[model samples]
Target chain A: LPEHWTDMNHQLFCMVQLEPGQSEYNTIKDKFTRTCSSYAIEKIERIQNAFLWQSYQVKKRQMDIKNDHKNNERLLFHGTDADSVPYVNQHGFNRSCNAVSYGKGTYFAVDASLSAKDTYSKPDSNGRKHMYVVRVLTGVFTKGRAGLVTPPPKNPHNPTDLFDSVTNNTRSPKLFVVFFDNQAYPEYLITFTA
Target chain B: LPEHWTDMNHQLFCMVQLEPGQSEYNTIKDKFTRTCSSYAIEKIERIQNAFLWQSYQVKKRQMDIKNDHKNNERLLFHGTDADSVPYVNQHGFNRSCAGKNAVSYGKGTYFAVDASLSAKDTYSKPDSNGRKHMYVVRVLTGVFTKGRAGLVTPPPKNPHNPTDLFDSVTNNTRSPKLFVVFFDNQAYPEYLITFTA
Candidate 1:
């Protein structure tokens, strides 16, 4: 990954600016503008955290080979604040105890625009807004419930054998959730206007 | 500090377990026993998350320091199932709703100076292996007043100052009472104590 200007702040993030004309920018721009239809992307920064990417790849291979979750990867969205954006970029999402309507874990949305709302992305002192386009491992899953702390065990007899993730709907889900720390990587920081 | 076993088992924590006779153990052990003294403590673990501590220190330092404190601190008890300890450890208590229990004194997060309320099954439900958990939190109580039913936010007019809102509220106006705070930043989930009872 080539060094970018934002990384020069000497902070804990490494991101590349995506220009409007590039297809990579258009791909993310399309993803960001898809549903809940009321916001505009100011800029998109592609994450280049080598360690996080390697760890994510490692989990992907392990799950793909052993659990037969060959097509487990997905791109999802989450939104919060500017101060929290750095930490999410650094160590990934904190399984915060905020809202757990569909069960506990870091929550993400398939429709990226759902996260661009004020209800999801709270603005900062200067009214700056932020959202994350995350790389997710939505492997073998189960339908999630309100008080679920961990995904239900895959086998009822052997409780240690558990589902990889959880979702709002098992058949066709809008939201995906994961309990383990390394299961989701903050792939992009999309700065926007709402 | 000294060495412990559980700290060796994981990747996320630098937590040290307290040996029963040691001074650090004695401090946390005594606090755990101060309220809800009947239950036995199987073990006490200190969370060594520097990031969580740094935020707590900054917020605490910002508080008013005095006897009838405009902002004061206390150690209080909170109970939750083992399922949620990790989230509470990293993110502080959830003050978003009061659906879990009563809102007689106001709708917000609750704590116990007398921890018997915390040890109840509604909050401290045992894990699948039957292990129960309770938390000893370092709370910045600020200025508290007696809270009443259906209160959405802490009282807008302070009783003494009349110009400021109370930071928290108590079950009663008198000394020695339970607490409910609207802001989660005031709670630092410092120690996790596990046991069968």
Candidate 2:
């Protein structure tokens, strides 16, 4: 019933838009069909295009967070409590979507213990469990961000990535790290428990 | 006791992955640090790239499903039983992920409901939900197709699209069908679901 109710235990349903040409849009359409028989490739393509555009918007926002770190604030904090650190002690959850939201690859993790000492500059090991953080930026609209608490790995080529590195043995009881941006308009928050 | 099995009651958490060289990512990162002063750009980029690749694969497979309908056997089914019919029934519950599984779109709906459906044909309101469906594919190497799905609109001046002519409720959901195609493999039963959202 709410907008972005993270606390709700409702299933996390991924919404995808399909367009006319792309192959990706077709597969999603089949999720609901027994065959590709009755579906229109062009329609799926449009949905995919729209979805990709939305995903692009989301992806851009994520990039903005990185750029912000590079241009304005070189560091990130854990909380918005004025004293809260940005890059460290960070915690929260994020949703991976299909068209609107990007999907997960290799492996994914939920809640894992993390410490402010961990820096994004230093990444954790493959399948290594650590603190996870997530937050949704709400101003004009609401969007979410999530990551592990361990410092970013220093060696850029550290083989395993945050997504792929995660395994089934990662962690449980995911953590929440939400904060509002200065431009946020409406307030929304929902939670889902495993 | 299993890597994928985490107490059925365990809570599922969401994660964010941001690609590099994007303004939104910079804005969010700066905005995040401005508030908390804690975040990582490179880390976000890495996660975003991985997710992008995954979604891409899913889209590829969806296309394969569409193209497959043009072949013989007419109907194919993945992650469902033999009784499943195209544009009719869909796999129960959510699509099964892990090991070799079918792409998890809207219950596995087949879009090209007719075997005569052509790749050149386009639809008016492509995505009923107007949202993209993301999933994983190609784990079997040679057994899978492109492994991805995306959204697309009509070709502008085409009036043949049956979806644009009827229904006042925007997404009649009953018109446009859905499907997926695999790469390496081609002789599988096409799974389809016909229903309104």
Candidate 3:
């Protein structure tokens, strides 16, 4: 069957460790500790999955054309338990997993502190916390509230036509939430000790 | 002069006292105390102002035509300080005086679905009469978007275009949603209920 040909291997999922003294590690460590407590850095791994990155870029170039690429792109963070980290490194963010306070979507933090909250970034047995730096497309957001399954429509008359995402605020947004999976790409996973 | 003639006496403002046990009073009283734990009604006055009335009337017409004549008008609650009662009676609502911290839906007059939230001791303060005042307003909540913070007006009618705006906004996209209105003319102060908590 053609299903055998399309069924892919785990070889496509690659995790590369960043050297401790490297430039890329410096910037991500700076991003993590600035809003957060200066936890000792342990490891930073780049999530290289061409399958998902290509899908993320496809949505980006398409939406960027409409949004002028200004508000369409953002570097954000996601926190998860240690057990979920390995699965996400391979399959990407699961929209159905986390319980929601705002939109029933994949929630991403604009700053490191929100993702550093104990609800997500908690310590494993090794005293290590897990967080991901994600590439999010936050196009034309509006305020989201509790129990919101999806973003509100961009137009009142047009109910089916929804905005690109929902946010904790309309002005200086702290959280960018998307209901769909492809709107985000898990670019890097950071493991650290607080 | 035309100015003096137009600015004649205060005949345009009228308040009709509703008799107790009448259908109108009972209906209004039922609305005022539904979510309220215990509120003893002191009085209920129906506010009448030709100036504000005509403004909402025409705006209602203008809204209906464009919104496919969809009448989303509703009866909602607003609780304000006693000091604000006279101002509203004379000039209607000042939509710009949105609460500094409560601008969850933008800078505009806020109304509520729950009477207690509106009539809580925070905004609905007692006067010399020892009574708190709340308004049961006729709000034209034409169409709704879940409002955003800091919006001076509602979201633009066309989100892609910067001009023109939605008639109103909602806390959630549920009703016939009460949410709120930025245009003062969108709400008519139909009844003012003076009650004791």
Candidate 4:
């Protein structure tokens, strides 16, 4: 809107109206020019409103889809039973198979960033699937050690009967890593190839 | 950019570069305008090779810090000792008290939304610092649910086997009404609530 700035850096692009004596206008103009330096010095006024509106609508629809599918799912699944080892996130992320659970323990994440299932309820829908995490430890597990063993006969109750097993053979207390011992469930395992 | 779609109805924008004879350009332009009806004219063009390059560098540095932290301490704490009760999270969340090995199933929600220390340490935080939740169940002898246990004993290996008593109480399992219980850590025999039990 201002002489020094352009629409490139604005969230609304051309839709934003500029009032005179506004600092935001100058800021937007400066940021826009930073991105538009390669283009011709054309008057933004000459640009047709129809095309600009059309593009904005398309972007809006895309955002709506993403928010509905991705963002909402994350909030809904926080501590509910719906908080399964593998769940679908609104971000087109399949949180299922991306996690592991310690017996009687909370969620354990082996890897925070893992690929998940990508369902095709619609083609090219940007619907990503399957983000495998090792454990759901933070949101799920009760007060317990990562490598601890439940009491004899393994009661999920009885936290005192729990023994904090040696997580790594090299660590003290000599706890054994159970659920992650073998990549048992393919649906629950995720590979991080970074 | 296309020449035909010159007039627009509203503000529109696209980042696609169009070639005069290329079919791809038309395809992109068509998709763009159809969605918003505002893609008629050129708006703003930016050329920031340095800024983008700098952003990439900053991102890489932060990512490296995260990667290193995950490998060194955060992952180790979470991976090795997050479950064994009494170990405590970085925020000091641990199962400080449980009943005498008697199965009392009391389910309450933990209101622990404090991300400050947990975000940094990930493990070793205690339950006192976390939030509390509420639930209803029968309070039978010797059996303790997560939230039901009045006195939780220390984990297997702590130097001092302190008995942490909670001021929590069992709600009326049959009537199915709500109850509140608070623990006074500083008071003697610290549990501070009454239940219909």
Number of the top candidate by TM-score? 1
Per-residue lDDT tens digits for candidate 4, residues A56-165, read: 23323433342334321011111112232122211112111212223332222222211111221111223212222222111112233433433122244743322221
Error of 2 at A165 (Å): 16
Clashing pairs in 1: none
lDDT tens string, model 3, B72-182?
Answer: 787888888877786677556765344653547776777877778778776677877778889988888887788887775677777565434577888787653346676
Cα deviation of B185, candidate 1, in Å: 27
Docking class of 3: incorrect
lDDT of each: 0.71, 0.24, 0.74, 0.23
Expressed as tens digits, the lDDT of each residue in B109-138 for candidate 1 is: 788886677888788888887777888888
Give the C-alpha miss distance for residue A77 in model 1, angstroms.
Answer: 0.6
| lDDT score of residue B119 within candidate 2 | 17
Interface RMSD of 2: 17.2
Kindly give the stretch of ten consecutive residues in candidate 1 chain B with the minimal lDDT sum. B1-10
lDDT of 3: 0.74
At residue B92, candidate 1 shows an lDDT of: 64
Model 4 bad stretches (over 4 Å): A1-101, A110-128, A132-194, B1-176, B179-197
TM-score of each: 0.49, 0.17, 0.47, 0.18
What is candidate 4's TM-score against the reference? 0.18
Of 3 and 4, which scores higher on TM-score?
3
